[PDB]
Write an enzyme that holds these catalytic residues in place. Structure first.
Site, PDB file in Angstrom:
ATOM      1  N   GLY A  78      11.147   0.628  -2.166  1.00 18.04           N
ATOM      2  CA  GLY A  78      11.409  -0.464  -0.788  1.00 18.04           C
ATOM      3  C   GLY A  78      10.148  -0.241   0.587  1.00 18.04           C
ATOM      4  O   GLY A  78       9.349   0.600   0.344  1.00 18.04           O
TER       5      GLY A  78
ATOM      6  N   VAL B  84       9.755   1.319   4.911  1.00 14.84           N
ATOM      7  CA  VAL B  84      10.149   2.394   5.493  1.00 14.84           C
ATOM      8  C   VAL B  84      10.405   1.766   7.009  1.00 14.84           C
ATOM      9  O   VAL B  84       8.607   1.302   7.611  1.00 14.84           O
ATOM     10  CB  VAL B  84       9.030   3.635   5.709  1.00 14.84           C
ATOM     11  CG1 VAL B  84       9.409   5.367   5.357  1.00 14.84           C
ATOM     12  CG2 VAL B  84       8.574   3.501   4.139  1.00 14.84           C
TER      13      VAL B  84
ATOM     14  N   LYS C 253      14.138   4.671   5.066  1.00 15.05           N
ATOM     15  CA  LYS C 253      13.765   3.840   3.941  1.00 15.05           C
ATOM     16  C   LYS C 253      15.327   2.285   3.447  1.00 15.05           C
ATOM     17  O   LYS C 253      16.253   3.339   3.517  1.00 15.05           O
ATOM     18  CB  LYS C 253      13.495   4.149   2.543  1.00 15.05           C
ATOM     19  CG  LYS C 253      12.002   4.756   1.995  1.00 15.05           C
ATOM     20  CD  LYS C 253      11.666   4.774   0.853  1.00 15.05           C
ATOM     21  CE  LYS C 253       9.314   4.881   1.266  1.00 15.05           C
ATOM     22  NZ  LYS C 253       9.513   4.340  -0.140  1.00 15.05           N
TER      23      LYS C 253
ATOM     24  N   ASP D 128       1.309  11.449   7.852  1.00 20.20           N
ATOM     25  CA  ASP D 128       1.229  11.998   6.568  1.00 20.20           C
ATOM     26  C   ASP D 128       0.055  13.071   5.902  1.00 20.20           C
ATOM     27  O   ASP D 128      -1.573  12.903   6.644  1.00 20.20           O
ATOM     28  CB  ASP D 128       1.185  10.668   5.211  1.00 20.20           C
ATOM     29  CG  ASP D 128       0.122   9.636   5.030  1.00 20.20           C
ATOM     30  OD1 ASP D 128      -0.996  10.194   5.746  1.00 20.20           O
ATOM     31  OD2 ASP D 128       0.650   8.462   5.060  1.00 20.20           O
TER      32      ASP D 128
ATOM     33  N   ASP E 118       5.624  11.819  -8.815  1.00 25.54           N
ATOM     34  CA  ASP E 118       4.901  11.025  -8.583  1.00 25.54           C
ATOM     35  C   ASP E 118       4.079  11.602  -7.044  1.00 25.54           C
ATOM     36  O   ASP E 118       4.197  10.807  -5.410  1.00 25.54           O
ATOM     37  CB  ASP E 118       5.639   9.555  -8.400  1.00 25.54           C
ATOM     38  CG  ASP E 118       3.876   8.722  -7.555  1.00 25.54           C
ATOM     39  OD1 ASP E 118       2.951   8.971  -8.167  1.00 25.54           O
ATOM     40  OD2 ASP E 118       4.681   7.723  -6.854  1.00 25.54           O
TER      41      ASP E 118
HETATM   42  C1  LIG Z   1      10.425  10.160   5.111  1.00 29.79           C
HETATM   43  C2  LIG Z   1       9.661   9.250   4.862  1.00 29.79           C
HETATM   44  C3  LIG Z   1       8.930   8.808   3.356  1.00 29.79           C
HETATM   45  S1  LIG Z   1       7.541   8.714   3.320  1.00 29.79           S
HETATM   46  C4  LIG Z   1       7.552   8.185   1.930  1.00 29.79           C
HETATM   47  N1  LIG Z   1       6.974   7.661   1.236  1.00 29.79           N
HETATM   48  N2  LIG Z   1       9.225   8.028   1.657  1.00 29.79           N
HETATM   49  C5  LIG Z   1       9.644   8.426   2.614  1.00 29.79           C
HETATM   50  O1  LIG Z   1      10.790   8.325   2.594  1.00 29.79           O
HETATM   51  C6  LIG Z   1       8.179   9.250   6.254  1.00 29.79           C
HETATM   52  C7  LIG Z   1       8.463   9.707   7.642  1.00 29.79           C
HETATM   53  C8  LIG Z   1       7.474   9.841   7.897  1.00 29.79           C
HETATM   54  C9  LIG Z   1       6.379   8.891   7.683  1.00 29.79           C
HETATM   55  C10 LIG Z   1       4.718   9.100   8.055  1.00 29.79           C
HETATM   56  C11 LIG Z   1       3.888   7.918   6.986  1.00 29.79           C
HETATM   57  C12 LIG Z   1       3.196   7.719   7.691  1.00 29.79           C
HETATM   58  C13 LIG Z   1       2.895   7.787   8.216  1.00 29.79           C
HETATM   59  S2  LIG Z   1       1.328   6.864   8.912  1.00 29.79           S
HETATM   60  N3  LIG Z   1      -0.155   7.848   8.051  1.00 29.79           N
HETATM   61  O2  LIG Z   1       0.582   7.632  10.501  1.00 29.79           O
HETATM   62  O3  LIG Z   1       0.979   5.657   8.811  1.00 29.79           O
HETATM   63  C14 LIG Z   1       3.527   8.183   9.384  1.00 29.79           C
HETATM   64  C15 LIG Z   1       5.013   8.469   9.207  1.00 29.79           C
HETATM   65  O4  LIG Z   1       6.877   8.942   6.445  1.00 29.79           O
END
Ligand SMILES: C/C(=C1/SC(=N)NC1=O)c1ccc(-c2ccc(S(N)(=O)=O)cc2)o1
Length: 279
Positions: free
Chosen positions: A16, A18, A33, A77, A118
């Site tokens: 899904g 985020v 999510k 990330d 994964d």
């Molecule tokens: C909680 C969570 C995720 S990511 C995922 N694949 N599954 C999650 O639950 C999460 C929290 C914060 C972020 C997140 C992800 C990407 C970025 S970015 N690279 O700056 O666009 C900045 C923050 O993901």
């Protein structure tokens, strides 16, 4: 979801979408999510899987036959940080710290026989404190997506694979942190496997007992010599090559376990430096 104001779309997946989100009640900034029945008992049990190195599942919300998982929010990330630091590369004490904590994380889940399934750099979340956590853990057992980090047992049709798959994935990401290129960038399943084979040699029965009996093993796979890690991950040092080597072992039962990697001489001088982010 009505207790949440969506601040910004922060990503996308196959499960899904985020969103960064602000809790109308608590004020907390969270990641939301938006995603049947044994999914709920499997998701609600991960809510009890807490570790400094796992992105915390704060809450699971079941409504309208839609599901929402509010996680703790980290700003960056690993993939983004990696593309960010492409011209100098993450400094090695920082690579080694990242790796240590990730393995701590996996040491924890693996105890409980939970596996991630994964791992990839887009699932590893970092903060300016120099911490790194695993996101999307356990979501897989419940319920283009890259194969870059896929273990060869999975690629070869093993139904019942083990925690060793996460150690394979971590090894691929570790190689990539050091070299600044993905280790095995397959564009399809056989190119993925054939890339693995070209670097580390086509597995046979001497290195991997039972390889030839697996479902998707063909006797007609081409036969490549193994290559030296001195050519794969320069200039990683011998402790690092040694470790990496043990994490990319073909035989899932010979592959190093997180617990054991933790005791490797590579982490002998491990520290906890803080990243240069801009997040
Ligand atoms: C909680 C969570 C995720 S990511 C995922 N694949 N599954 C999650 O639950 C999460 C929290 C914060 C972020 C997140 C992800 C990407 C970025 S970015 N690279 O700056 O666009 C900045 C923050 O993901």
């Amino acid at each position: 979801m009505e207790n949440f104001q969506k601040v910004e779309k922060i990503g996308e997946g196959t499960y899904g979408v985020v969103y960064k989100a602000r809790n109308k009640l608590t004020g907390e900034v969270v990641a939301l999510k938006k995603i049947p029945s044994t999914a709920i008992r499997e998701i609600s049990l991960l809510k009890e899987l807490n570790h400094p190195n796992i992105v915390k599942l704060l809450d699971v919300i079941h409504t309208e036959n839609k599901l929402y998982l509010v996680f703790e929010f980290l700003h960056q990330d690993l993939k983004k940080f990696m593309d960010a630091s492409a011209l100098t590369g993450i400094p090695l004490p920082l690579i080694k710290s990242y790796l240590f904590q990730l393995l701590q994380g996996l040491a924890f889940c693996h105890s409980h026989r939970v596996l991630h399934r994964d791992l990839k750099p887009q699932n590893l979340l970092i903060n300016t404190e120099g911490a790194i956590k695993l996101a999307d853990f356990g979501l897989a057992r419940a319920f283009v997506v890259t194969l870059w980090y896929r273990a060869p047992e999975i690629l070869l049709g093993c139904k019942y694979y083990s925690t060793a798959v996460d150690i394979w994935s971590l090894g691929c990401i570790f190689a990539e942190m050091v070299t600044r290129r993905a280790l095995f960038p397959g564009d399809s399943e056989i190119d993925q496997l054939f890339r693995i084979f070209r670097t580390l040699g086509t597995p046979d029965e001497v290195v991997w007992p039972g390889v030839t009996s697996m479902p998707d093993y063909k006797p007609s796979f081409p036969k490549w010599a193994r290559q030296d890690f001195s050519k794969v991950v320069p200039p990683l040092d011998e402790d690092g090559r040694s470790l990496l080597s043990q994490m990319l072992h073909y035989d899932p039962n010979k592959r190093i376990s997180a617990k054991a990697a933790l005791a490797h001489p590579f982490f002998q001088d491990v520290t906890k430096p803080v990243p240069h982010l801009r997040l």
